[PDB]
Amino acid sequence: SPRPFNEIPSPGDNGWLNLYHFWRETGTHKVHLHHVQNFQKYGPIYREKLGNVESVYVIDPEDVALLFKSEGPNPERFLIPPWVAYHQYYQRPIGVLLKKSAAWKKDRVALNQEVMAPEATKNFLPLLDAVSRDFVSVLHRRIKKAGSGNYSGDISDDLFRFAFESITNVIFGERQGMLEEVVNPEAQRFIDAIYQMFHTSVPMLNLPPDLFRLFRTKTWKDHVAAWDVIFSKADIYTQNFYWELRQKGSVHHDYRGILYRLLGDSKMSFEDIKANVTEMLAGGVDTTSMTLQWHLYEMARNLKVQDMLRAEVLAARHQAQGDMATMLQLVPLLKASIKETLRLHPISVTLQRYLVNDLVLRDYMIPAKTLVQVAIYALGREPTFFFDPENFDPTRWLSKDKNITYFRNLGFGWGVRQCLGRRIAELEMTIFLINMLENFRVEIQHLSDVGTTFNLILMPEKPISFTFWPF
């Protein structure tokens, strides 16, 4: 008695017509709003073919749970078509992001041992702390320079350089110098290419490669140029590290970074390692930086919450007697505030899985091989799933009612193919915010609501200018 697939509410079966109306009414850079509006229009489940790709969209955590309950051993998400086309056409070695089945599993398991396992990740603490402490020093320097007892500015560019320094430090065990007054321009080029690769992805999204070649010729060209900078720089770093290792040929007892571990004790070939280094580097720069910027924004918008997080951090530093490793298990509210930041400001608009087997959702039969998307952004703003969703309230994640948070913490995805950088990102952000909260109060002058723009990853729609006061 479950309804057939075609009875799922839908704007219609013409993908090109659907694409036309999406661009006309909402716009490519507002796909998150498109999702919100569609659930308002159709209810909690709908299907929409956009251009060539059809998906079923869900918002209800109970449906999300069923989706992930039926997951197979080698899950597949939606592959970004211009990314795939660039790698295939220009014959670039692929990493874990673009692989599937057994070849994906092979990379993933090798990578998990160096970047996910608690026994590997404990080594990240000193490397990430060093970078965050240097960030703090930059701000103290700018405050001194300003002569006003404070510093006001848009720090988005500093945050990109912070994220780059952090990911490179854990990968290479070496400082790139991106937080110094005089910066490596070739590393800045790498940073800028990552943003450009994301931004240029958007006009090609719902199109097959045959069409974006023909109607998005300039964008495709710019996109190819962004990825070329990414691969070229990453490959130089990796090759140089490989040869330096042989030049200094000493068996080190001290931790030397992820790459050292992979090259010395991995089942991965050098080519797989170099491909995955490229992805980790590119994945690390725009994700934590934007998420941290939103966190700072929410702290400035919610001064009482900022006070409570500071009070928690100071007590944890005291109780841990200064030790970072101990401290990180004593900041439950800070960690909750990160979940809360990702609820309202997800990096990823959706999660997606291709079904392995037929599946029923809300009395509708969804056939195997169908793409199903969980609308993460829409979920986070939905008042039936979160009390007062517009309010930044970290304590909602500590609720002893363990049905208030059921399948709600979805920012990094789920299961065996969840975010590969999740531990790096969680540790980088928590350590960053500990250092910031100990050192400054954050405010925004003339605070106004900052919206969101879809630039492949979700990002603030306009610049945010903070005021920092030393604490």
Next chain:
Amino acid sequence: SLLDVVVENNLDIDGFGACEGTLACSTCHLIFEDHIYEKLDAITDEENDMLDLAYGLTDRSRLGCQIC
């Protein structure tokens, strides 16, 4: 760990311990009886997060790959 037991003992459960003991899935999910539960060290924030997204949750359950 209880994962390494299932691995080299060669038990049944399909896809149990999919991430292979890196606290990066929740397929090693197991239910413990009261007297064994309190005997084990405090639960990390990371394990708690994985547990909230594990289907069929119990207040006496833990991740198999994190139990020595």
